Design a protein around this ligand. Structure first.
Ligand SMILES: [Mg+2]
Ligand SMILES: [Zn+2]
Lengths: 674, 147, 226, 75, 54, 627, 233
């Protein structure tokens, strides 16, 4: 959804990352309500790529225009005008949150307004021409999905908005307890959910399709995508939510998408979080997880890899996909079918055969599972020119194999909230080791204190508090009268049951006093005990020693996202292998078994240590030398001393290159010419 | 340099650099600044060749200048006259003595021509030219004293 | 101020599956560590039974649909995660389930063999329309703690058989309180209360007995020496 | 003063070894040449001190250095 | 509301939104409909007061 | 030690494991050992555990800003894909665990392994080579834990009491173990003042000579008027280290580690830092430091201050509307008034917070953060810049606790994007300066022990001032400290104080000050007469080792890295496209003619000044009688 | 069901009164199940006799110092606290120590009643100046663990009575650590280490054995409910 709404300044006829200055990257006062100031990439594309504001539309000349309510004589009126920035500079626009009494007159005589200089001022209430239609007119979709946005620093809000886009789908989706009003419309407009076109009743429900009969009497059938691979490899499973015979109205969600529950978006899971340091295992933003999340697959995800192999022709004849590979063991081709394609449902190991192919010389050229990869063969697709496959020239057959892998959360995987509080899982603890509430419930996650104050994203703390107020119900006493702190709560928020979801929009939501009062008004637990005091803290017990911690700890519920930076493919290792040819240095690539680069700064560090021999190994044997490599590898294999290098190989080629230009280059000993 | 002289120039440069760092709350020891500044004042421009082989107007390392002056004066010749010259780190880098290192980052053909007609011998004192050759760096573990 | 009185243990039931066990008297500062040791043993090492693999007629692997059923195979396995069972012997036991036509396939539809029973037949597994035919073969086994889905090619070589993660823990929740019911405040004692709740495949009494038996053997190491 | 049991590659203490050489750089080759000699012996004076089950020659050389079982001359 | 199946997420908002959030994919679809000169786009344009839009 | 993934270690140590597969006859042909290891057949793992033993590995994080960016560690096999990094070496790598990655290299030859084990090993690289200050020392959680452990609180349970004609002191224990027993029962607070009989901990110097005519030895009892936590902390220090009895601020821990590094072997301090790490983690876990909306206190004085400054702003508005003030000058005055308001609110917040509140506790403990961030959190954000870098006159009076209004947040985003955008340019400028310094420092190596010259430079140690007393210069640690004396320090009566060639450390500084020395002559590389490179004596001691620099060590690259590494902390050139910082540093090292040039006196003499309307003219009458 | 293998218990001695015990190999995560409770039983669950009160002549009130002795009243209280008394009778015993003349008075000067013993006679109690003298009566009794100084509201019928903290536990100090070990291709099995330091009235081995037996019975209370479904070793 954000990609479709992306605005890119770089491209054909535009600018480039190489030389675009800060001037074009900087936020501008004309961006208000048109381009999001928060949601932009953090790398070299900083400022060059942004997002359209939620209320903005495009002028037919291509200019971005945003809606404003007309204001006259100090009374706001319902006429909406879409103004461009050039038009808006000729007006005075007031803040939407400005109070107005019956029929629209401003209560106070002075009002915040924006002015042509990109300025903000207290003008007279009769000096206003326009007003913003919503408090969040400036934010994009991903920014609007951050609760308590105004309590988070701009950098961390940017990080959270960016991270929301890289959250991987989970096997089961769960909507956040603390959310905005934006999840539902964002999910619906993203289009991954299936929506009924016209009012009717469900005739059929199946894991694959749903059939509805409209009031017109005509019939509609909807097909669900099951375990389909996304462009990034994430699973795009769609699920039916409606029951047979159910009333379904036009526009009603009929099937959930990969990251939706009951139509509204669900990018993460609600975890019971305690805010405390813990034995140094959450040091420097590391995260501690309960083993429950691994056991119950709370943070498990499915990934589908796609492999291709094509049978072609050459000057020396055609190529054959076949089971009859030369010299391969009888078992190694056991799971292959008659054509030589691995059967569906086979558990394929790293390096195992997927599709057998041979070519003239014959030779073994079969498709094999890459380094580290594994899973179940989920699907096969095949194309042949005998079927008018429309493949390019010089290819006779093509086979695509899909391998499905289910990954549990593991050490080194990144997690993050919606507030930019990213971290790496440093430890997973048994359920009995986690600090647990007096009720006996162990916390799901431990987040270190030392992160919050410095990073300036206390919105994660507030959410946590409200999260508890969302899990445990609340009930405000009204027998004598409404409490003062609750005097701005709508009558519908005076009480709610357990597990009740709430919305706290980004710039018009829960205030501090309301949240504190609700913390004081939470329902007790199953046994009648109020587990968390009015300050949001609880008396946790140490799961190892067993004694209570000497001070209460902040406990609540936080919405946590599993990010796509998983460990499985972020790890590299090498000890010799393929090499470059035009120059003889190693390769570099995730799937090419490449080695690590040694830059000049690392050479500087080695020289500073004075570790001459290690630097020589890195410079010559491990990188360029061919003879040195074969010799050293065989020396290690034979368990003998690594030979001390003699005359460098680079020097001998350089000497002949110099001599070819008629230069007499001579090696001199400390005692004389030699 | 022209008023107070070379040593006072080195002291002044170290003073100014460390003042800039101190005003910014950084804690670099003076000796690193001195190590850097020593290179900025490493060469002398020759006024008169005297009885030496030095070319007038040419830049000369102070150590070589003194060594040849003492040789000639102990052999009855007039020592060459020299003027200290202050150089930025960039120009000090360009004025290197090793033809290998100069060839590695200057116009290679000019460097090679100059070294060839002059018949320069490179002593491989620096780390850069030893890396270029592929030899053990002449520092730490790699020096003759320890090898 | 030496005390000759030995602790005593008693039970107070609160539900069919939950009870509070009182131990008193205890030395001051002693209740928390004893309660925590018992809690750790209860959460970690009480044996149980769980499903270890399943087969479905039309399914080759976990990532597939089955015609006529609302839930895909992954949802079916994740629903079976809610199945609680207790085989009386350690050897694996194969249960069978068969259903045709409309209806809700619940855990009561399972027809287990002797010595094993499903304690929550009301649990929902699947929903079948007119065309839905569901045949499921389940392998139960006894074990301890938690074990991930055993790799198919490692445990055996049967294709179509799809493993599942196994939780061998009949203990649901455990907590403890320690209170100062000291003797007339002339001298100090701690009173320990351990609230234990199980999945109803085993009573709190038997689970606590197992925890105590497990702990005594480990603490007996020091008794063997001189 | 006293120090606790050196674990792993910490033993022998770096200061004890360093007291037997003009510098850490000298100690590096003092250990490396002896390790090469020991590995040659295993392949073809040999280790002067009780080796372990699978002890590496460098550890043996360092433990011999700690014991003052070796002498050297700088270049 | 304008979403029949919406779960009842209670909101802390005080101010009402006088304008609904527009179609979030309109930036793509309206532009493409202009490109192909769709009937819907033409009607919308003449409703906006554009003179004989092309 | 560092933790390596099992699969990663297997692939790195592939030939080394294959050798033992063939030698252990787990495989017959090495060409089959390759396949055996490549398939991870279960036998190989147990071989790896013995191949990996005592074979160090090099760990590197990018960018390598200085020497400590590469460190050697003993690999321990561990489950999972992630490398386990020791918390103390993180600050040397500038690493944190929000996603960072590190590269691992395996030395092969015997020489390379010896270099990794002796030179690059982490336990041998505690001190920074740039300043000699420790880097692998407690941080964050550990600092907070030790600060909580050694803080003294008044009114806690079990604290000391005076004899009152009715009971004894009531706060005395026969041994620290008795205090441990009392703490475990909840009778004694770890932070409560008590009196303890200590026999294993050396008393302070003030007490040792008073209590023991021939010095303290283990077993000799003395009475410590200290909290139990301080005793437990002191038990972590070496057996022969005097009792400290102080609140462990980060500065005090740095002082203690400095003492250990200067006066004890390297292994001793290496073990001590690990012990401090363990204690710090424990008492950080048990310090109770947590964040809640209740702990974020707002000072009640805020609104009165804001109303006062709003009255001042209204007065300026009246004066501007009266024509007495310019627009830009109005902006100036409003900016200054609101800066005063920000300072007032900061003072109010700092005085209102209780000493033991977690938010202020983290800052004041020196663990992390600063008071400015606290004021932004609970006070007021203050003034923020527009894209041109000018302060917007109207401040953000809201705090992040209250939550900003829409326009406050919008105007806040400008500087945030500025900072996000310009960081790469700052890094590039620092790297360029570092590269040029490295290029010029290519051949500066310690070539000989001593050039035997008597040249040197003068270093001022103190200024006598009015009282004629020992006012030592604050920055002396970077000028005189850690150098070789060029000539003997001599008093007014002709007696020496310190011998020629001595290492001018803290004891020497104290001796000189006690003897009334204000200036000394010290050897320097500026004056070294060595024919090639520099000599060890003129350079002095290595800051990392604390001993005379070894022959052959490349001081040039170390100096270049030391100068360049903190470059990003300096004020940078304008990227808006005289301020100091990096722009002037590049100016000084390039020997360019200053833009803000000032003339200097060619001759000593008396100044005759002939000022003009808008220019100055100066004449110097030389005291020598010259021109 | 049986387990991989039963643990083994090993011992090492730092000094005659300080041992270190090591249980290895242990099932993952049971090191914290064992060690903390073992430490608590070692500290608090071993009976022993200790001095519970004292009375020194000449300091009936204004308890600061006693003439004829350089040690202050509090220092003498500390010295008496370290006294290793042992009693074979549960009821309180009153005992008397008396000395005169210059020199030193040590624990060996005590003459305990029948069934009462002092295991550290060499312990220095006080130093006596020229012509000085010191007489002190001690009330000793049995208990477990550690007890703060007695509330003594009932006093006033006698003067000079000093309540003192009672160190009944024969165990002086205990500290436990848990570390990783390997038993197979599997990793992260528990190894439990525990330092035990005791007063010479008991050896660390005896303290550990008594604590282990106490825990065995105390958790056998639970298996008195039933015996089935435990680990078997
Ligand atoms: Mg990071
Ligand atoms: Zn010198």
């Amino acid at each position: 959804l954000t990609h479709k709404r992306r605005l890119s300044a770089l491209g054909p006829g535009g600018l480039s990352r190489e030389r675009a200055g800060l001037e074009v990257r900087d936020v501008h006062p004309s961006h208000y309500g048109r381009m999001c100031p928060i949601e932009t990439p953090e790398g070299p594309n900083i400022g060059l790529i942004g997002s359209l504001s939620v209320y903005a539309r495009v002028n037919p000349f291509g200019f971005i225009e945003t809606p404003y309510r007309k204001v006259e004589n100090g009374v706001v009126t319902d006429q909406i005008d879409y103004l461009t920035a050039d038009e808006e500079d000729r007006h005075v626009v007031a803040q939407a949150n400005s109070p107005t009494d019956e029929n629209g007159r401003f209560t106070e005589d002075r009002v915040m307004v924006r002015k042509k200089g990109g300025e903000v001022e207290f003008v007279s209430a009769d000096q206003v021409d326009y007003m913003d239609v919503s408090p969040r007119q400036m934010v994009s979709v991903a920014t609007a999905m951050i609760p308590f946005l105004e309590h988070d620093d701009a950098n961390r809000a940017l990080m959270g908005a960016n991270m929301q886009r890289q959250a991987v789908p989970l096997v089961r989706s769960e909507a956040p307890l603390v959310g905005t009003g934006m999840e539902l419309r964002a999910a619906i407009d993203a289009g991954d959910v299936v929506v009924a076109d016209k009012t009717g009743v469900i005739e059929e429900v199946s894991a694959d399709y749903i059939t509805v009969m409209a009031d017109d009497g005509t019939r509609q059938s909807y097909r669900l995508r099951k375990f389909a691979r996304s462009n990034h490899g994430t699973c795009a499973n769609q699920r039916p939510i409606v029951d047979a015979g159910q009333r379904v109205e036009a526009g009603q969600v009929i099937a959930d998408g990969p990251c939706t529950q009951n139509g509204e978006m669900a990018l993460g899971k609600n975890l019971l979080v305690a805010i405390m340091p813990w034995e140094g295992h959450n040091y420097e933003d590391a995260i501690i997880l309960s083993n429950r999340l691994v056991e119950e697959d709370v943070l498990t995800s499915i990934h589908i890899e796609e492999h291709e192999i094509d049978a072609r022709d050459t000057k020396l004849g055609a190529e054959e996909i076949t089971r009859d590979i030369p010299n391969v063991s009888d078992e190694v081709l056991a799971d292959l079918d008659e054509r030589g394609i691995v059967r569906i449902g086979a558990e394929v190991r790293d390096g195992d055969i997927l599709v057998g192919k041979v070519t003239p010389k014959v030779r073994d050229t079969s498709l094999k599972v890459p380094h580290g990869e594994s899973g179940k063969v989920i699907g096969i697709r095949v194309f042949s020119r005998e079927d008018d496959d429309e493949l390019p020239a010089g290819v006779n057959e093509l086979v695509r194999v899909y391998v499905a892998q289910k990954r549990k959360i593991s050490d080194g995987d990144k997690l993050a909230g919606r507030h930019g509080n990213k971290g790496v899982i440093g430890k997973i603890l048994p359920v009995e080791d986690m600090p647990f509430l007096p009720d006996g419930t162990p916390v799901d996650i431990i987040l270190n204190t030392h992160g919050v104050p410095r990073r300036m994203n206390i919105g994660q703390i507030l959410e946590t508090h409200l999260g508890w107020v969302a899990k445990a119900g609340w009930n405000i006493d009204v027998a004598a009268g409404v409490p003062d702190w609750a005097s701005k709560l709508p009558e519908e928020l005076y009480s709610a049951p357990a597990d009740s979801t709430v919305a706290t929009p980004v710039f018009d939501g829960a205030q501090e006093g309301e949240l504190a009062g609700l913390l004081g008004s939470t329902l007790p637990n199953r046994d009648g005990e109020v587990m968390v005091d009015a300050d949001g803290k609880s008396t946790l017990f140490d799961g190892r020693s067993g004694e209570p911690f000497p001070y209460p700890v902040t406990v609540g519920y936080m919405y946590i996202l599993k990010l796509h930076h998983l460990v499985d493919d972020k790890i590299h290792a090498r000890s010799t292998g393929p090499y470059s040819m035009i120059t003889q240095q190693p390769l570099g690539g995730k799937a090419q078994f490449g080695g690590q680069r040694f830059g000049e700064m690392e050479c500087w560090a080695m020289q500073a240590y004075g570790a001459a021999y290690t630097l020589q190994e890195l410079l010559t044997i491990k990188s360029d030398d061919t003879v040195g490599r074969v010799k050293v590898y065989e020396a290690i294999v034979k368990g003998e001393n690594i030979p001390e290098p003699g005359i460098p190989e680079s020097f001998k080629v350089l000497l002949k290159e110099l001599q070819s230009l008629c230069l007499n280059v001579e090696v001199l000993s400390s005692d004389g010419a030699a | 340099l022209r008023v107070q002289g070379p040593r006072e120039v080195q002291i002044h440069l170290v003073k100014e650099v460390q003042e800039v760092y101190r005003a910014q709350g950084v804690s670099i020891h003076d000796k690193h600044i001195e190590v850097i500044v020593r290179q900025m004042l490493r060469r002398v421009t020759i006024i008169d060749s005297g009885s030496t082989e030095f070319l007038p107007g040419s830049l000369t390392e102070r150590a070589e200048f003194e060594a040849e002056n003492r040789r000639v004066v102990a052999e009855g010749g007039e020592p060459a006259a020299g003027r200290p010259v202050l150089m930025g780190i960039t120009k000090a880098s360009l004025a290197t003595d090793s033809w290998l290192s100069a060839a590695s980052f200057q116009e290679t053909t000019r460097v090679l021509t100059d070294a060839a007609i002059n018949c320069r011998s490179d002593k491989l004192n620096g780390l850069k030219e030893n890396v270029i050759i592929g030899k053990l760096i002449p520092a730490g573990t790699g020096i003759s004293r320890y090898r | 101020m030496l005390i000759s009185q030995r602790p005593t243990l008693s039970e107070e039931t609160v539900a069919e599956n939950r009870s509070r066990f009182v131990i008193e008297p205890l030395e001051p500062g002693f209740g928390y560590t004893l309660g925590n040791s018992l809690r750790r043993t209860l959460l970690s090492s009480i044996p149980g039974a769980a499903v270890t693999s399943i087969r479905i007629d039309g399914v080759l692997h976990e990532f597939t649909t089955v015609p006529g059923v609302k839930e895909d195979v992954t949802d079916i396995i994740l629903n079976l995660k809610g199945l609680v069972v207790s085989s009386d012997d350690d050897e694996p036991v194969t249960m069978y389930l068969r259903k045709q036509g409309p209806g809700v396939v619940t855990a009561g539809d399972i027809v287990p063999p002797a010595g094993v029973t499903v304690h929550n037949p009301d649990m929902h597994i699947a929903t079948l329309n007119d065309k839905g035919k569901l045949e499921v073969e389940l392998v139960v086994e006894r074990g301890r703690g938690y074990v991930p889905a055993v790799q198919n090619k490692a445990s055996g070589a049967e294709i179509g058989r799809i493993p599942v993660d196994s939780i061998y823990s009949p203990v649901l929740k455990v907590t403890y309180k320690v209170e100062a019911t000291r003797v007339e405040q002339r001298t100090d004692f701690d009173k320990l209360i351990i609230d234990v709740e199980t999945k109803n495949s085993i009573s709190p009494r038997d689970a606590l007995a197992s925890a105590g038996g497990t702990l005594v053997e480990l603490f007996g190491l020091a008794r063997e020496l001189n | 003063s006293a120090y606790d049991t050196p674990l792993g590659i910490t033993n022998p203490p770096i200061d004890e070894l360093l007291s037997r050489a003009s510098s850490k750089y000298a100690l590096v080759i003092y250990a490396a040449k002896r390790a090469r000699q020991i590995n040659d012996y295993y392949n073809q004076v040999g280790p002067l001190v009780e080796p372990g089950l699978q002890e590496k020659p460098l550890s043996i050389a360092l433990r011999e250095i700690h014991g003052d079982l070796l002498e050297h001359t700088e270049g | 509301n304008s979403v029949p199946g919406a779960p009842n997420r209670v909101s802390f908002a005080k101010l009402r939104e006088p304008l609904e959030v527009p179609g979030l994919l309109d930036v793509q679809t309206d532009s493409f409909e202009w490109l192909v000169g769709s009937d819907r786009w033409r009607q919308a344009a003449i409703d906006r007061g554009e003179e004989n839009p092309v | 030690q560092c933790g390596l993934p099992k699969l990663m270690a297997l692939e790195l140590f592939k030939p080394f494991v294959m050798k033992r597969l063939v030698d252990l006859n787990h495989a017959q042909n090495i060409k089959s050992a390759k396949r055996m290891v490549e398939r991870q057949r279960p036998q190989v793992w147990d071989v790896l555990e013995e191949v990996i033993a005592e074979h160090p590995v090099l760990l590197n994080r990018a960018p390598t800003l200085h020497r400590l960016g590469i460190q050697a560690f003993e690999p321990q096999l561990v489950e999972g894909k992630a490398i386990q990094l020791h918390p103390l070496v993180c600050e040397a790598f500038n690493a944190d665990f929000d996603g960072d990655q590190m590269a691992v290299h395996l030395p092969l030859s015997a020489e390379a392994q010896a270099e990794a084990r002796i030179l690059m090993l982490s336990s041998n690289n505690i001190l920074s080579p740039a300043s000699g200050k420790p880097l692998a020392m407690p941080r964050l959680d550990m600092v907070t834990g030790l600060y909580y452990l050694t803080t003294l609180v008044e009114g806690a349970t079990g604290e000391y009491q005076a004899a009152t004609k009715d009971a004894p002191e009531q706060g005395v224990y026969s041994s620290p173990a008795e205090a441990i027993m009392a703490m475990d029962r909840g009778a004694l607070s770890v932070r409560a003042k008590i009196k303890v009989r200590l026999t294993e901990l050396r008393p302070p110097t003030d007490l040792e000579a008073q209590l023991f005519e021939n010095g303290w030895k283990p077993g000799d009892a003395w009475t410590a008027e200290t909290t139990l936590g301080r005793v437990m902390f002191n038990e972590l220090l070496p057996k022969s280290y005097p009792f400290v009895n102080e609140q462990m601020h980060k500065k005090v821990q740095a002082r203690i580690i400095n003492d250990l590094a200067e006066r004890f072997p390297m292994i001793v301090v290496a073990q001590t830092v690990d012990k401090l790490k363990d204690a710090g983690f424990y008492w950080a876990t048990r310090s109770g430091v947590t964040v809640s909306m209740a702990d974020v206190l707002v000072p009640p004085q805020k609104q009165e201050i804001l109303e006062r400054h709003e009255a001042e702003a209204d007065a300026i508005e009246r004066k501007y509307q009266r024509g007495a003030l310019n627009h830009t000058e109005r902006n100036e005055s409003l900016v200054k008034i609101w800066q005063d308001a920000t300072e007032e609110v900061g003072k109010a917040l700092e005085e209102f917070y209780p000493a033991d509140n977690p938010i202020i506790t983290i800052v004041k403990s020196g663990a992390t953060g600063n008071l400015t961030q606290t004021r932004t959190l609970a006070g007021m954000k203050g003034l923020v810049t527009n894209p041109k870098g000018e302060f917007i006159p109207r401040p953000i009076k809201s705090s992040f606790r209250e939550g900003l209004t829409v326009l406050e947040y919008f105007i806040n985003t400008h500087g945030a994007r500025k900072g996000l955008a310009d960081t790469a340019l700052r890094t590039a400028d620092s790297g360029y300066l570092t590269r040029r310094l490295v290029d010029v420092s290519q051949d500066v190596i310690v070539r000989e022990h001593d050039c035997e010259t008597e040249r040197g430079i003068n270093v001022t140690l103190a200024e006598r001032g009015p009282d004629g007393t020992l006012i030592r210069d604050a920055h002396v640690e970077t000028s005189a400290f850690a150098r070789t004396l060029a000539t003997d320090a001599v008093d007014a009566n002709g007696n020496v104080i310190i011998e020629r060639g001595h290492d001018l450390g803290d004891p020497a500084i104290d001796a000189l000050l006690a003897a009334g020395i204000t200036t000394v002559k010290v050897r320097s590389v500026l004056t070294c007469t060595s024919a090639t490179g520099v000599c060890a004596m003129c350079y002095g001691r290595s800051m990392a080792t604390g001993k005379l620099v070894d022959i052959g060590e490349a001081v040039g690259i170390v100096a270049a890295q030391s100068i360049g590494e903190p470059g990003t902390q300096l004020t940078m050139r304008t990227f808006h496209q005289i301020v100091g910082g990096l722009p002037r540093v590049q100016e000084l090292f390039e020997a360019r003619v200053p833009r803000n040039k000032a003339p200097i006196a060619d001759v000593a003499g008396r100044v005759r000044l002939e000022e003009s309307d808008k220019f100055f003219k100066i004449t110097i009458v030389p005291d020598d009688g010259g021109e």
